[PDB]
Amino acid sequence: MIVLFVDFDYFYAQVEEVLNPSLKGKPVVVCVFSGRFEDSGAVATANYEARKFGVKAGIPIVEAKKILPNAVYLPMRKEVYQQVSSRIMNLLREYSEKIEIASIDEAYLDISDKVRDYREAYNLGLEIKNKILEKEKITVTVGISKNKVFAKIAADMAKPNGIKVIDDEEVKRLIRELDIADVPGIGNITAEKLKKLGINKLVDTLSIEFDKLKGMIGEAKAKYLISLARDEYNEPIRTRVRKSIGRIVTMKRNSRNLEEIKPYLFRAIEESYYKLDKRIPKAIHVVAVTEDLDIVSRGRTFPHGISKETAYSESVKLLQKILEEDERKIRRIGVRFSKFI
DNA sequence: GGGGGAAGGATTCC
DNA sequence: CGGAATCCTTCCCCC
Numbered sequence: 001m002i003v004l005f006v007d008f009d010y011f012y013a014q015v016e017e018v019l020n021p022s023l024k025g026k027p028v029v030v031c032v033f034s035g036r037f038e039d040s041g042a043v044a045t046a047n048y049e050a051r052k053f054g055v056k057a058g059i060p061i062v063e064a065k066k067i068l069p070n071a072v073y074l075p076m077r078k079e080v081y082q083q084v085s086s087r088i089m090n091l092l093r094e095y096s097e098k099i100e101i102a103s104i105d106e107a108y109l110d111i112s113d114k115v116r117d118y119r120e121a122y123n124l125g126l127e128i129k130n131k132i133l134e135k136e137k138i139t140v141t142v143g144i145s146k147n148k149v150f151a152k153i154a155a156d157m158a159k160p161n162g163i164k165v166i167d168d169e170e171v172k173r174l175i176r177e178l179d180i181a182d183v184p185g186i187g188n189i190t191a192e193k194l195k196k197l198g199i200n201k202l203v204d205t206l207s208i209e210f211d212k213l214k215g216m217i218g219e220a221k222a223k224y225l226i227s228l229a230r231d232e233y234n235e236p237i238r239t240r241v242r243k244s245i246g247r248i249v250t251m252k253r254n255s256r257n258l259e260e261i262k263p264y265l266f267r268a269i270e271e272s273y274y275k276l277d278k279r280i281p282k283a284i285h286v287v288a289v290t291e292d293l294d295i296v297s298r299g300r301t302f303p304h305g306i307s308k309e310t311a312y313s314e315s316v317k318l319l320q321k322i323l324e325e326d327e328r329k330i331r332r333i334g335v336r337f338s339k340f341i
Numbered sequence: 342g343g344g345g346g347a348a349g350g351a352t353t354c355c
Numbered sequence: 356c357g358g359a360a361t362c363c364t365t366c367c368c369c370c
């Protein structure tokens with residue numbers, strides 16, 4: 001089995017360099033402005049020029065501007081990158097439509113029938129890469145190996161504009177020396193827990209007692225890591241696609257006034273519906289970040305689809321429910337529709 | 342003991 | 356001082 005992975009280099013930031021090439025060679029920074037008055041928000045992504053001075057994804061627009069006050073800060077136009085994305089995905093769609101669209105800028109292609117041997121697999125990466133760069137001037141990185149996870153790791157290493165193949169022997173070595181931190185689906189909050197239990201690499205997950213792990217990193221993530229350490233990992237390449245659509249916003253101020261929140265909630269719904277389109281959702285969740293930035297969401301699953309009218313209808317009580325079981329001040333508020341039909 | 346789901350909490354950037 | 360989703364663990368009715 002040979003899986004070819006593709007990941008768009010600094011996607012958002014880059015796309016903006018396509019619609020306005022004057023920025024390349026310059027620090028570009030895509031941002032999300034909340035509006036709770038100026039500079040407030042976060043960073044979505046930053047090109048490499050920007051990254052090398054400390055500007056990464058996740059930092060407050062203010063702390064970033066202290067590093068590059070002369071950098072270009074563009075608000076995020078997700079709808080744009082989305083289209084640009086779909087294009088690169090449909091182009092890929094046929095190099096093996098036994099492909100999985102992981103995210104707005106990720107995909108997995110099972111090139112088993114379409115080819116064998118890495119040599120060729122590689123030569124089909126520049127092929128794929130070359131095409132995308134030509135047809136859309138976007139630089140991407142490719143990963144190749146026996147399974148999805150490792151294919152990604154190959155790409156994550158040689159980025160950007162890279163193409164790396166890490167098959168069989170190297171796999172063993174990574175299972176031995178790769179840093180647990182760097183394992184797909186292993187964020188910060190999971191990496192440290194993992195050090196505590198004395199694990200810093202994949203292989204180490206075979207020395208610890210299966211229970212200590214479920215005990216801490218959840219039976220879910222637990223089985224995952226072990227499976228990898230035994231290079232007994234294998235999950236087909238099947239386009240697994242979106243199972244929830246929502247919209248969340250920041251109230252100009254924090255509060256517990258039902259009639260003050262209501263408007264943002266009704267704006268979130270309205271937009272969620274529009275983005276839902278023809279897809280009919282059977283479950284609805286009212287979400288609201290507390291000021292200590294926690295996440296409390298009260299939902300519901302009907303035995304049938306939700307008409308916008310109903311969305312409005314239940315959204316209110318789910319919201320009333322929340323206030324009714326928590327206490328904190330709701331900073332941001334929204335809704336999320338799932339269980340489509 | 343466990344299927345089958347709905348619900349609420351946490352985590353990753355999937 | 357963001358925003359979108361997913362992941363995942365506990366609760367629940369009941370055969």
Ligand SMILES: Nc1ccn([C@H]2C[C@H](O)[C@@H](COP(=O)(O)OP(=O)(O)OP(=O)(O)O)O2)c(=O)n1
Pocket residue numbers: 007008009010011012043044045057058105159160354
């Ligand atoms: N806290 C975060 C983290 C990431 N993203 C966005 C940034 C990108 O728009 C998208 C994909 O980011 P990746 O990390 O997968 O890849 P990058 O876009 O960062 O490029 P690169 O992997 O080459 O660094 O996720 C976000 O909105 N908020």
Ligand SMILES: [Ca+2]
Pocket residue numbers: 007008009010011105
């Ligand atoms: Ca990327």
Ligand SMILES: [Ca+2]
Pocket residue numbers: 007008103105106
């Ligand atoms: Ca990515």
Ligand SMILES: [Ca+2]
Pocket residue numbers: 180181182183186187188191
């Ligand atoms: Ca990591």
